[PDB]
Amino acid sequence: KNPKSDKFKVKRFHHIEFWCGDATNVARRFSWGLGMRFSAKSDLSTGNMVHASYLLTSGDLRFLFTAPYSPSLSAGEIKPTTTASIPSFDHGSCRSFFSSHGLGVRAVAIEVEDAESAFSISVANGAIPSSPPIVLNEAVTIAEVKLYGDVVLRYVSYKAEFLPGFERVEDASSFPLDYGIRRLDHAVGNVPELGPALTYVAGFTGFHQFAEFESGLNSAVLASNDEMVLLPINEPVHGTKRKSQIQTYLEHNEGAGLQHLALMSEDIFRTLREMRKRSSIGGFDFMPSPPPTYYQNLKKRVGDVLSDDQIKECEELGILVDRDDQGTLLQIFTKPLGDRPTIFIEIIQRVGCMMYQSGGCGGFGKGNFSELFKSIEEYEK
Amino acid sequence: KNPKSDKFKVKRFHHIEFWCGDATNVARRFSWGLGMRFSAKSDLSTGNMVHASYLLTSGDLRFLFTAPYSPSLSAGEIKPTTTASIPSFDHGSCRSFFSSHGLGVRAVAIEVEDAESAFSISVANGAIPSSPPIVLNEAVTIAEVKLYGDVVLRYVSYKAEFLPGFERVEDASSFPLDYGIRRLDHAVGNVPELGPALTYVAGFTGFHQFAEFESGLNSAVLASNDEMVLLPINEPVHGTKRKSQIQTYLEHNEGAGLQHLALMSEDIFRTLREMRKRSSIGGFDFMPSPPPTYYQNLKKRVGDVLSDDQIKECEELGILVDRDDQGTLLQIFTKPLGDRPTIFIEIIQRVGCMMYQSGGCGGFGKGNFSELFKSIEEYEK
Ligand SMILES: Cn1c(=O)n(C2CCCC2)c(=O)c2cc(Cl)c(C(=O)C3=C(O)C=CCC3=O)cc21
Numbered sequence: 001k002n003p004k005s006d007k008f009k010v011k012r013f014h015h016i017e018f019w020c021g022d023a024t025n026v027a028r029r030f031s032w033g034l035g036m037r038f039s040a041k042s043d044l045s046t047g048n049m050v051h052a053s054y055l056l057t058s059g060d061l062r063f064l065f066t067a068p069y070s071p072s073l074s075a076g077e078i079k080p081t082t083t084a085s086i087p088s089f090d091h092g093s094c095r096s097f098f099s100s101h102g103l104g105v106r107a108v109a110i111e112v113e114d115a116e117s118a119f120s121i122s123v124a125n126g127a128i129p130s131s132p133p134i135v136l137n138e139a140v141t142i143a144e145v146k147l148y149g150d151v152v153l154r155y156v157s158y159k160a161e162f163l164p165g166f167e168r169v170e171d172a173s174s175f176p177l178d179y180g181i182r183r184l185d186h187a188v189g190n191v192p193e194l195g196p197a198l199t200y201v202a203g204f205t206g207f208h209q210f211a212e213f214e215s216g217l218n219s220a221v222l223a224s225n226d227e228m229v230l231l232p233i234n235e236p237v238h239g240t241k242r243k244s245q246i247q248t249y250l251e252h253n254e255g256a257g258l259q260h261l262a263l264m265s266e267d268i269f270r271t272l273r274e275m276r277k278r279s280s281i282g283g284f285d286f287m288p289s290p291p292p293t294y295y296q297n298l299k300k301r302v303g304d305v306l307s308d309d310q311i312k313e314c315e316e317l318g319i320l321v322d323r324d325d326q327g328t329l330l331q332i333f334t335k336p337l338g339d340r341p342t343i344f345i346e347i348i349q350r351v352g353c354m355m356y357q358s359g360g361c362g363g364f365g366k367g368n369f370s371e372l373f374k375s376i377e378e379y380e381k
Numbered sequence: 382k383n384p385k386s387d388k389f390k391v392k393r394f395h396h397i398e399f400w401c402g403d404a405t406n407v408a409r410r411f412s413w414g415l416g417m418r419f420s421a422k423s424d425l426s427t428g429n430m431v432h433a434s435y436l437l438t439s440g441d442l443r444f445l446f447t448a449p450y451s452p453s454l455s456a457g458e459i460k461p462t463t464t465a466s467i468p469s470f471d472h473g474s475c476r477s478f479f480s481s482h483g484l485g486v487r488a489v490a491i492e493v494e495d496a497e498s499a500f501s502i503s504v505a506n507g508a509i510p511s512s513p514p515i516v517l518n519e520a521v522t523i524a525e526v527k528l529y530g531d532v533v534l535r536y537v538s539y540k541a542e543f544l545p546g547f548e549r550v551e552d553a554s555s556f557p558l559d560y561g562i563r564r565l566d567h568a569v570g571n572v573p574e575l576g577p578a579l580t581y582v583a584g585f586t587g588f589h590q591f592a593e594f595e596s597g598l599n600s601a602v603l604a605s606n607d608e609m610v611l612l613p614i615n616e617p618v619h620g621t622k623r624k625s626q627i628q629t630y631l632e633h634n635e636g637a638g639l640q641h642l643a644l645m646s647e648d649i650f651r652t653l654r655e656m657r658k659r660s661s662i663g664g665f666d667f668m669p670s671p672p673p674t675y676y677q678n679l680k681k682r683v684g685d686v687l688s689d690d691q692i693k694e695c696e697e698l699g700i701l702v703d704r705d706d707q708g709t710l711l712q713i714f715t716k717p718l719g720d721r722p723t724i725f726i727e728i729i730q731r732v733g734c735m736m737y738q739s740g741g742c743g744g745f746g747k748g749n750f751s752e753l754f755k756s757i758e759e760y761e762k
């Protein structure tokens with residue numbers, strides 16, 4: 001069931017912003033690693049004396065990477081006179097964020113019809129304000145509320161190119177990398193307690209609990225009216241024998257935060273081939289491959305949907321496959337993006353639910369937990 | 382003249398250590414960008430609950446990248462019980478360094494016969510101590526004194542694999558990249574005042590002023606007995622019309638620090654081809670090419686040393702060429718390595734001075750300052 005109870009008009013995921021200590025180096029690593037083009041900058045060369053910000057794009061996916069300059073460059077400025085293109089930026093908040101969490105996501109940004117309204121209704125409905133609505137060059141309105149930990153949910157709206165004050169990067173610097181990634185499918189948070197996190201977030205957005213369908217997790221997924229903004233949230237399951245990865249996250253991250261970003265590919269096989277080509281020459285590493293018994297059991301479960309060749313192609317690249325009652329899900333997980341065992345990336349592709357494809361088609365992989373336990377039974381097979 | 386007045390036995394450059402906020406991402410960028418292999422780690426997977434450290438190697442060149450974990454992982458430790466493989470590391474110093482300077486070099490490390498002696502004699506002779514000598518697993522001794530700004534000169538000595546507590550990385554993770562870079566030739570500091578910086582450093586090392594031979598700089602080069610450790614130091618020339626780049630460095634870096642690392646290649650042409658192949662897909666950018674009039678004038682100056690083809694090959698890659706009274710120098714400069722216009726890299730190759738090649742053969746490029754002014758005269762040619 002879908003109550004469609006959004007308290008304001010939500011469009012799509014708009015961008016993800018990483019807070020870094022050096023934005024240049026993270027952005028160049030991510031660009032090679034994921035096949036994302038350099039498409040806009042805001043930094044010293046564009047008159048920004050406050051922060052360096054570099055935008056990477058692949059399809060509709062927008063990864064923003066921001067780091068602070070020395071405060072002494074902008075010490076003579078005040079908020080009315082600022083050179084920062086993102087007015088919510090704060091030297092102190094950014095340094096504290098990065099020293100506390102290391103590299104990670106500061107903002108999950110969603111486009112909305114009216115960001116000032118979305119902020120007002122949100123704060124009216126329990127949201128902890130983070131940065132009040134600000135109208136940039138009479139063109140774009142930007143507002144931030146607290147989502148969980150030190151991650152903000154960022155509203156952006158356009159009357160009618162990323163943000164004012166950003167320049168398009170010179171194409172001689174802009175190499176058209178592309179490994180098939182196209183949009184953000186879901187962004188997932190880890191918290192110590194799922195209940196209060198849920199009722200807080202659903203409280204101020206009006207997002208509803210999404211469909212879906214004993215290892216470490218309890219989760220639930222919040223979704224907008226058309227279920228194109230998908231916001232899962234995890235909590236640890238204490239007391240088990242293998243320590244909860246959610247609990248390991250909270251310890252190394254110093255509390256709640258964004259656990260993983262799921263990027264949709266239009267061709268998960270080409271994406272995974274290309275990312276695996278570059279794992280050891282600057283790119284990203286991937287979780288260990290499941291045992292071939294896993295793949296010796298997928299014929300009995302999705303042989304309907306994938307040919308005997310594609311199932312073997314899955315075995316090469318280490319792809320995981322799950323299946324809702326409507327669609328099928330292909331998914332794989334990277335190793336952590338940085339020093340800490342905290343944030344990681346998930347590459348996915350969804351097959352089914354044609355009307356366009358409806359959101360969350362196939363789910364998030366729920367069945368693959370029990371299916372990997374009863375496949376790591378291969379020790380005598 | 383060479384007094385050979387080293388106050389202790391100095392061998393060669395041993396490694397350069399960058400202090401970062403995320404060591405993983407800088408190291409992977411640098412590895413792709415410079416063609417350096419991953420050869421050793423010390424991090425959570427090796428029991429280090431304090432810092433993540435990743436070593437890149439090309440030839441004898443060793444780039445070390447270190448970032449702090451959350452202090453809470455090691456809060457129950459004391460210095461006698463530490464899990465840090467580098468005992469001089471300090472969460473507070475590292476965070477303060479990186480928030481103050483951004484990405485940059487924390488240590489210039491030189492191998493010496495006896496690091497405890499080198500520290501004692503150094504401190505006896507004016508050196509500001511930074512970390513006292515510590516003997517690691519009865520195998521390696523490590524000591525640090527202040528060099529300039531927040532950069533330390535690090536002494537290391539071996540009784541008889543990088544450091545104890547580092548592991549060699551699994552070769553499946555270790556891709557044998559190589560673009561021809563082989564060793565560190567010189568490491569250069571910017572300071573506000575050259576005199577006191579000079580007499581401080583020469584004071585405690587016994588290094589002597591090196592050979593050599595109106596834009597922005599005053600410099601001088603300190604050198605060990607065999608002149609294989611070369612430590613130039615710059616100061617700004619105020620009052621000119623084009624603001625001193627040294628002065629721009631001091632402002633954006635928040636004071637003195639390491640300005641550039643010069644890496645020797647055994648084939649500057651293959652190095653520059655390979656690095657330029659990767660500039661826009663994660664690697665490093667290079668300074669703007671000099672005008673072809675520069676290259677139309679190199680025949681008259683080094684046509685003795687380089688064929689008409691190699692001189693044109695220089696023009697492709699943007700290589701600069703200078704000439705001492707003994708040798709010839711090929712050199713080119715990258716754009717800054719990170720967000721700030723502070724640290725950058727220089728690729729060089731030296732031709733001449735065969736006895737082995739003697740240090741500093743060809744100099745450091747002194748003649749190329751006046752030669753670029755009187756070549757940017759091409760506006761009417
Ligand atoms: C399917 N699956 C899995 O099998 N494992 C295996 C791999 C071997 C050991 C345990 C995971 O670790 C794993 C981890 C995550 Cl975060 C997800 C995931 O995407 C996810 C969501 O998007 C939303 C809510 C909960 C949720 O779990 C799926 C996983």
Ligand SMILES: Cn1c(=O)n(C2CCCC2)c(=O)c2cc(Cl)c(C(=O)C3=C(O)C=CCC3=O)cc21
Nearest residue numbers: 569598600601613641727745746747749750753
């Ligand atoms: C030769 N040369 C040059 O021509 N320029 C040009 C390029 C167009 C505008 C000015 C430089 O900026 C430049 C910069 C540096 Cl740091 C060096 C260099 O390596 C160096 C040392 O190693 C040691 C002491 C001093 C010193 O200067 C050489 C340069």
Ligand SMILES: [Co+2]
Nearest residue numbers: 188262346364
């Ligand atoms: Co997921």
Ligand SMILES: [Co+2]
Nearest residue numbers: 569643727745
């Ligand atoms: Co130099």
